[PDB]
Design a protein around this ligand. Structure first.
Ligand SMILES: *[C@@H](O)[C@@H]1CCC(=O)NCCCCC[C@@H](c2cccc(Cl)c2)OC(=O)N[C@@H](CC(C)C)C(=O)N1
Ligand SMILES: [Cl-]
Ligand SMILES: [Cl-]
Length: 166
């Protein structure tokens, strides 16, 4: 069910935190549209800053899901999994050790987020390092309660990643 939250969106992915809250990276979001997921813009509260986008829908969009904890990044040193899917729906998690919060200009856009380091398989598949992989969530486990703390925004050709954080 965790992976059923990861949804193809625009030029990447996003993540359902709850039935009404969807997060993604700003640069993958469609532009010049009258709706997202069939809902009018009048029924969505949208907040975008520092390459983090949050949609709060007035209607229950993903009632199949429970709510989980969304936090604004994680402590330095946390090991997260980036829940990358590819177009088949295949599940390809990327393990990352997270570093410090900062704001970094990457290809003209300011990313407010956390850099991290990837922990040969990933490279063979360009995991995290193709445009279609952005928006995937960074998660870690607190007991058996899952915490999402960012969205994939950037990564070097070849092993630093950046997730945008609220
Ligand atoms: C998702 O859209 C994509 C994932 C990262 C990716 O595709 N990397 C392969 C291309 C790498 C180009 C360089 C990197 C970069 C530059 C400087 C610092 C860092 Cl850590 C990474 O460019 C990006 O990652 N740029 C991302 C889009 C920006 C608007 C944030 C990007 O391509 N993300
Ligand atoms: Cl879940
Ligand atoms: Cl910007």
């Amino acid at each position: 069910t965790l992976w059923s939250r990861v949804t193809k969106f625009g030029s990447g992915w996003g993540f359902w935190v709850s039935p009404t809250v969807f997060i993604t990276t700003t640069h993958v979001v469609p532009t010049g549209v009258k709706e997202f997921f069939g809902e009018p813009l009048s029924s969505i509260a949208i907040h975008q800053a520092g390459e983090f986008t949050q949609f709060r829908f007035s209607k229950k969009m993903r009632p199949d899901l429970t709510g989980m904890v969304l936090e604004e990044g994680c402590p330095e040193g946390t090991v997260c999994s980036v829940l990358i899917k590819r177009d088949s729906g295949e599940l390809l998690p990327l393990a990352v050790r997270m570093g410090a919060i900062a704001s970094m200009r990457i290809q003209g856009r300011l990313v407010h987020g956390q850099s991290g380091m990837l922990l040969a398989n990933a490279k063979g598949m360009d995991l995290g390092t193709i445009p279609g992989d952005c928006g995937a969530p960074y998660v870690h486990k607190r007991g058996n309660d899952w915490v999402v703390c960012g969205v994939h925004a950037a990564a070097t050709k070849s092993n630093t990643v950046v997730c945008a954080v609220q």
